[PDB]
Symmetry: C5
Subunit: 346 residues, 5 copies
């Protein structure tokens, strides 16, 4: 025939096609097979508990009214503007905060109609999805980001969503994240929303992201350790140098206070302790105990010669005991925090 006539013949007034009626109106529910292709991944903000994604959302379903045989071609890669003249599933993202299409030059849309009536519907989307994050074990945590594909108007008696058996989630090659590693395996679950308006279909993916500790070591693990070592210099400073040892205790304690507040600058105001909070608390306790060590030496040395060697013994004991107890803490902290991270994500 001609390319234009076939398009407006299969659907329209002459054929009787109605886009407001689901394909099998009073029969079995429509089964929509979905699969996504992640084009980009980033903007993971813990303060707002969300992340931004850019995906190619593909949907496959069978429409018996769109089946054709006369036209010679097998598939039919048609124009996007007609997408309003056909029935489409009312998919929506349950945990979506913001979303939009793309019209950079034309509509970033695709539609194919096969001979048997199968419809492939691909679309480009930018999504801002909410992600509740557990920040206990914060510099060393594995977050799980979810993506729920839910129907809004049709129940399970009308619309059912299914993930493709092969490759429901595909990630673009070379897609890296500056802060996390995206695990190769993905979890495909079966959500089902139960409202007072009825039952609604839902499908869900889970992405596992491990936080990289290279930034946090050079940002607040090594500089705080350096402050603890800098506090240990006072044990070798001469005893009568009171403005020297006291200023050494003070600058280290106040710096540890500012570094402790600086470790939560980019984090939400949660109300539970974290692993970095435990490390900051122990380092602050160590520098404060070093200052209390000199406050005791300064008090013991003036009680009037037993008191000259008794105060010097505290300095000699603190020279070896302060790094040994800090090493024992470092062993227990790092070992138990590399033990909890081997726990299964599931």
């Amino acid at each position: 025939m001609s390319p234009s006539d076939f398009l407006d013949k299969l659907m329209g007034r002459t054929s009787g096609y109605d886009a407001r009626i689901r394909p099998n109106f009073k029969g079995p529910p429509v089964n929509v097979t979905c699969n996504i292709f992640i084009n980009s991944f980033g903007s993971i903000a813990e303060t707002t508990m969300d992340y931004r994604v850019n995906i190619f959302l593909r949907q496959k379903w069978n429409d018996p009214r769109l089946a054709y045989s006369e036209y010679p071609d097998d598939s039919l890669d048609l124009d996007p503007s007609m997408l309003d003249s056909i029935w489409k599933p009312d998919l929506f993202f349950a945990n979506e905060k913001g979303a939009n299409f793309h019209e950079v030059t034309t509509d970033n849309k695709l539609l194919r109609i096969f001979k048997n009536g199968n419809v492939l519907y691909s679309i480009r989307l930018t999504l801002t999805l909410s992600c509740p994050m557990d920040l206990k074990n914060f510099p060393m945590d594995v977050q799980t980001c979810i993506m729920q594909l839910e129907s809004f108007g049709y129940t399970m008696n009308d619309l059912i969503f299914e993930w493709q058996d092969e490759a429901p989630v595909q990630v673009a090659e070379g897609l890296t994240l500056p802060q996390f590693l995206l695990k190769e395996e993905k979890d495909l679950r079966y959500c089902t929303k139960h409202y007072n308006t009825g039952k609604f279909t839902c499908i869900e993916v889970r992405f596992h992201l491990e936080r990289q500790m290279g930034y946090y070591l050079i940002q607040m693990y090594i500089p705080s350790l350096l402050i603890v070592i800098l506090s240990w210099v006072s044990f070798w400073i001469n005893m009568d140098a009171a403005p020297a040892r006291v200023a050494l205790g003070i600058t280290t304690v106040l710096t540890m206070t500012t570094q402790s507040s600086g470790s939560r600058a980019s984090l939400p105001k949660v109300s539970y302790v974290k692993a970095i909070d435990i490390w900051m608390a122990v380092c602050l306790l160590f520098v404060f105990s070093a200052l209390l060590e000199y406050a005791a030496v300064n008090f013991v040395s003036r009680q009037h010669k037993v008191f000259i060697d008794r105060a010097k013994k505290i300095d000699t004991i603190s020279r070896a005991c302060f790094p040994l107890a800090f090493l024992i803490f470092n062993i227990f902290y790092w070992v138990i925090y590399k033990i909890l991270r081997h726990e299964d994500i599931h």
Copy 2:
């Protein structure tokens, strides 16, 4: 019949339906039963005095012109695009700063028409609602967020809003807030706007949110207490160490000044004192009195031996009196601030 014909028969030119006319035009006012489902809750900013919500707004009313009997089906879950061909209430949010719909894939809308003429109208909305906050008792406060549903064009003689008798407000399971606890009980009030243009219907919910103090203890309650203890080390420092005790008083006072200004960084510029302001003022008064204590010891010790034991007596008295008076203040501050919080929200 056929699915398409019934939809355009009940309403349209042939039936005579007009979407610009309320159902009972010159009779009793239309009663709209409303109930909301909170999908997300967050973005509670004290600086802008607002919070962001994402709800499913359901509206129920009876339209006698939409009653049908011939079609076999009980309910009629129809397509959203037709929503312009029917009459809908002109609901609007009185305390709304910004609002928008959702069109992530299709319209996030739902409409059902029953046999008797009842219309269920569900919609997805993102709202930025203004919330006036009282920050007296700030680290330990219970805020009340409101949501007013008001008609804009119709008076009480035409439109009346009512909350559903069962479950007007439903919260999604597992919805947590990083900063607040959402109380299970909700207050359903009856606002009524009186303008010079007439009387207008209004309904209102109240959400009670208790601020969690876990963040604020580790952020500005314990570090300021540590500065007060660090200031108490000077009482044990040797008397003639003037650059040591003076630098101890100075660094503690200047740090208390910076922490006091740091406690109001994320707060609006209100003009009344708060509980954290009282705590910061007392801690600043304590470290400043410790420095004045050494300024008196340094002045008394040089008046030329009575003056050697008289100045030492002030040090010995301040060693026990400074923590005892600080403990008495801590008891009165915490007790009275755990007494005011047991006061009923209502």
Copy 3:
């Protein structure tokens, strides 16, 4: 008759009504009576010199072509969607930076047509209006925010704007501002724009806002005073304690420098001095003169015993003279700044 027929009969093709023609086309100019209702007030930013408002804009004018008598009803509260089929004034805000309507559920619009032809047109608007601010006397200033309602296309020969005789401006009950007090009285002026395109009508309101000083006292008035008192401790510190008195002068001067820069953090980069700048300059001069006082005592004490009592006399004189001169400055500063604020706003 029927409700629908009357609406499309009064205006349309059959009646001959044209929305592109002003009511009295070649007669007296159309007089539009305007009055606003402020729903919210806030977002007053000095850096961008603007403020955000949310108002109900009401407009009243007479259209002889819309007069009816046959229909029984007195007023006619009709549907908003028809608002395009009638003539409306081309009002616009002269000092508007950004503006938008509201479509949270439906159009936030209202239109009534009376028997004689009077048209009441209410609309909801969010406005970001520019406000030039004079920040001399900044912590204690009264700003005047303006709102100009101007016609864009019609001259005085066609369109005239007037304020309602009773209640042109109404403020919602309980509307408070965290930073300012909104004065109860308002000024209704008569602007008139003179361009090269002709003469254009304009009406203007003026809002008077007094800045509350409760925040600024605890933020940068009392902490700077505390630094000045902390600088006065050096006069009581022992004379030979050079690292003590010198470090006392240095930390106070550098802190006064940081507080002076901190007082202009949220302010625009204006090029005239302010009241807080005068207070910061005098406090910085006081702490710098205290350090120069010890620099003179340290120089006088070593000139080799007259020089021992001569240097001690400067300390004794500075003990009483430094707070007395600071008290005299505080009296003159506060008195003259409570005198300028009693000056009439007009």
Copy 4:
């Protein structure tokens, strides 16, 4: 006749008017006379190198097909909605980053048709125009902001842009800028874009803006000078006070480092030196040389009495030489920077 009939008679199907055809299709090019009225000016950000303006753009051209004689009126101030039914020039701004119209109540548009066929077309626009800035001589610089009005689709053979002979640029009375002075004179140039698609018309204005130095004197010129004077106190401090003079050198050098980094906080990361960078570098060199002066006095004083008066001579020489050399630098810096600013803008 009637007002409505004339509007649709001059243009439309009956007359044969086509909005897709330029007035003189195959004759001389259309000459469009342009003039702008600046309503607001601000948001000048050096980091993004742009500024925001709000203008009334007026365009005048002759359309022979719009000439009328029968209708009685001289000019014809018509309704804005019809603006799509006539031909308009395809003006666009070459250096525009973002732009939008205004629809606060209606379209902020104006169109007049005269008897001879002249068309006056006024529109309200908000523009974010890019401005390349030269920041050498930064606290004391005169920037030149440009505005290019270019045609996008028509060449010089079809469309020519011209500035009005009288008042091409008019500024609203009382329009001030918090950071700059807008020079009264303006430069009207003749740009002409040469692409591979052909030749295109362009016209350009230039605004000269002088930066006000009142903010920068009190922000980083006087506080850095105060640090230099504070560093000169060490020359009067006693020689053996090593922790006093050393702490005086250290706090001044570290403060000069922080003030130097603070001077470029709101500036883009350019790679050439500026006048404030030269001032910061010389002030940092002065305080660092004062510390090296005490490092030399402390080294010379202990070489074992010639060495007691030799080290004291360096202190006495540095007491007068350090302010004299700083005064000579201040004279040469300010004189040459008030000489370069008298250079013609052109």
Copy 5:
């Protein structure tokens, strides 16, 4: 003929033209020749790993159905509004985060139809393109920004994209960047996307940008060097001045810590070391070793005269060895970092 009739004759119902059908429907694929003109370049943010561009995108292809001979004119520069009535390629940008058109006064679009059927289609676009950046060698790095032009709906059997043989990329004259130099040469590659939906055409440019080091030298290369020199003053400070040398070591170490954290303020949280991180680590190691040098001198000097000249020998050796080893590090650091930058970009 007449200008209007020809436009609607070549395409439309009478001619049979369909915009939903590609020109050669069942023949060879359509070859689209593309070339871009960069109007502006900037907003290069490393934190979000993106950059903003403003380009003129030109597309050339042959449409046999648009060939004409009767009309006299060679080319046909027509009106933009008709652009919907013709077939256009479905180009889209693969690495695009956000994009929009421009409608400042009219559509910023251009279309020309030649006699043989060639179509030139120019459009103005603002793009926010993602750019993965390697920040190893960060203050001295050459980034490569890419721009992929990909088809969304048509495969290689239908649509093929090609770069123009002459001048695919043209940069506007005088276009400078405050932070980078845009290399004159550009790389034109051949991407080809392989999805599960089929094969898709793609073309790609590469821009090479060299970071300018003028800002980073005065921002964090020279101030850190000054801290290292300031730490070398302690070697000349007198030995028994313990509060002087200790405070000199402390302020320098804490300042180096704050400058090290300040060097990564505007950078993303990557987990690999950079060149500035290596420089900051070595400078921190140098000032910390200077403090350990005085901690050893202070310990050796009190062991009770051999111990008086033995501790003085460490001071004399450290006076020359500390700058010599720092000079050797500076030679190896700068030489190897000027060697890696001569490596070919390709």
